[PDB]
Symmetry: D2
Subunit: 212 residues, 4 copies
């Protein structure tokens, strides 16, 4: 009688977040005290940056897609206590100060927990905690065209800096760390959130876990 | 009414082992033949009857049994079309050595779930669009070939020299020219085949709800 | 006989930039312009002529200019195989925007080495055999797209949403279906494009050895 | 005056050794006496490690990955190649035993040196020593068939172990260590020894370096 962990990985702009968000919307799970399906984001677990790390982040020279940018120790400790059925405190990152807010999110033992992140399967110890591993596979240049429109129309970034960072940081980090972990996935979901047959296949299964 | 599921992938990817394990876990080897709710169809059954010009190239060894032309696309369509209507259809039996369909024919009663597996299940738009769920088994090209080699010595009596020369000349190009460009039509992708237990129970549990719905 | 070198690669992979560099390190830009030893023929010059019902599809942005059907294979084959025979040829001149086969032509005197660069330079079997050496520029799919986006915005005054929708709808499928499967036929693959000075000097120096005897 | 270092990498049975073997034969370099060769070939396999007793224990149990970067004397490769650029006569080991070597092989300062190995571009220090880097990119299932034949003919081991070792050790090492180093190549050579257009391209370049520019 433990929480069912489902790990979700894939490249940036592949549709991870929309896939998981569509699942819980489809179940209807959005009371936080009594919710049975919950979503954890790797983005919650960014390390606290030093003043040298803060300063390069302003000049765009920090690599937020590198595994060194994330608190693997915290992620493992948080996800182990979740499989042990405890309540855990999820950090709330303040990107302005590039540190953690003292205030923190409280998540209770849910029957199924979704953990989505680009490097979710990177660490083996974290990787063995997942009962089910899902990989959102969409084409490298399809993902790029999505990320470019997101960063301009939603975040208002400069086009050249977008593409320069993608080639310097995002692309290598995905090819060196993320994509090597595709083989660890039990089930591969192509094309992301538009793939409704795959989403409904996952949706029903979570209810069967919720039903019994 | 019946739920059709298309399974595809290259040879030795494990599609046949996937389906066999799926119906096995559903207890379908205990349900009687006329009462089976889950049935497995193979594209290998629908090989065309080869012409005497086709058989000439086959006996020589210049025929490609992984090419789209070697399969009876129209009969597959008609049969699968008639399956969806709840009609009982009759499945031909193919004699490989004679490249013709035997006078014997197999009966399949309408099951609630139908699994059709084959290297070219998704090649034709018309057959492709009859699958409510399309599964692809995505095993590495060198891993599959390793299984094929061990397979084609226990299954048949042939040289190592024979298997690889045939695979390089016939099986490899037909996979890449025809099978692989159809992976884009897959709804779900099952990496390693019957080895992937998580994926199988997920389809097994999905089929249970369909049966129990 | 003229030494024909066919250069292929996806869009924005750096084919033209490599071809322009090769002749620029050889010394043709500072030379008597008529009858250069080496000449670059771009496949874009040989676009097909039909544009009334196609112009109906083409004008709004509903046309695929990346499809092989849009390229005069027979003219390609005619001009190239005539160039091999040592003849002088006339090359069409085109407006990329207006679908214009201008009345004028560019007269190309026969050269010792001829570079033919195009996305589908290796597509048709007949034109492919005319090439002594076949080069392919293997720039990654997202790297090419980032180069492509920056070029169209700056050099063509075009906006992102149309550029990206044109690339996803048209450029991407045609490359994967037609251009990418012809990497099989390349003799030498050049990884990154026009910065790869080691591969450029290797081929620049090889041509010099053909020019020098 | 400093020797020209050419790095050749690529998977097992990609054709590395043959490409280097063919290129020196076409230059007639094995005709000359050992004391006055102008191009020489160095194999990464000659520089395997003398490994610790803890590493001996994993090796004796049949569970050591000889395709892993740790199994090669990175420091010996780096110093030997560096002393060759210093025009010094050097000494190379003979065959990782079946974890030591006895005699040595004298290698006098050659004008061009070909270093071939699955991980020749892996270490940045040794990778930065090559004035030209070539990658021989043969497909995975194609490279397997070549190797499973090569392993049977030259070694004689039974089939079930050759395939089991490739899937367990060779395949993962290639994709983790060799494959990521392809992006460092200056030129990619598609099929190996049979690619005589590319071979003759490289044979010609070395002939120019050997005399004049
Ligand atoms: N809300 N933040 N989302 C972000 C992305 O989702 C994460 C990438 O994985 O990190 C954050 N970044 C912030 C600022 C920046 N210049 N680059 C980043 O990447």
């Amino acid at each position: 009688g433990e929480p069912f962990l489902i790990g979700v990985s894939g490249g940036t702009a592949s549709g991870k977040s929309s896939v998981c968000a569509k699942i819980v919307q489809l179940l209807g799970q959005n009371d936080y005290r009594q919710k049975q399906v919950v979503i954890l984001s790797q983005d919650s677990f960014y390390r606290v940056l030093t003043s040298e790390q803060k300063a390069k982040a302003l000049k765009g020279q920090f690599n937020f897609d590198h595994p060194d940018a994330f608190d693997n120790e915290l992620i493992l400790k948080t996800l182990k206590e979740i499989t042990e059925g405890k309540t855990v405190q999820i950090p709330v990152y303040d990107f302005v100060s590039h540190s953690r807010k003292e205030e923190t999110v409280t998540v209770y033992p849910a029957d199924v927990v979704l953990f989505e992140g680009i490097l979710a399967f990177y660490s083996q110890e974290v990787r063995d905690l997942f009962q089910m591993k899902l990989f959102v596979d969409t084409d490298a240049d399809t993902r790029l065209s999505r990320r470019v429109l997101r960063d301009i129309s939603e975040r208002g970034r400069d086009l050249e800096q977008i593409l320069s960072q993608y080639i310097t940081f995002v692309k290598p980090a995905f090819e060196e760390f993320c994509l090597p972990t595709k083989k660890y996935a039990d089930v591969i979901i192509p094309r992301g959130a538009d793939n409704l047959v795959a989403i409904n296949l996952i949706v029903q299964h979570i209810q069967d876990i919720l039903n019994g």
